[PDB]
């Protein structure tokens, strides 16, 4: 279980994210991202998503664990 979240105000739609790790997250209506997803919990979905945090410019991509 990871739940990955976005913080709407550090968002810039740079869109690495979409990019990069596309089952995951995707550009709302107002060209900020959003997960597709509320839960993630194939290993293989979390490393595209671990990769983007690490890769978002204003990094305001947060992963989750329970
Ligand atoms: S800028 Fe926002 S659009 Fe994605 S790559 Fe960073 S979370
Ligand atoms: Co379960």
Do not use: H
């Not at 839960?39 to 595209?48: A, F, G, M, Q, S």
Request: charged share 30%.
């Amino acid at each position: 279980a990871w739940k990955v979240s976005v913080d709407q105000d550090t968002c810039i739609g740079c869109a690495i994210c979409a990019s990069l790790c596309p089952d995951v997250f995707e550009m709302n209506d107002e060209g900020k991202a959003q997960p597709k997803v509320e839960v993630i919990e194939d290993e293989e979905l979390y490393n595209c998503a671990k990769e983007a945090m690490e890769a978002c410019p204003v990094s305001a991509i947060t992963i989750e664990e329970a």
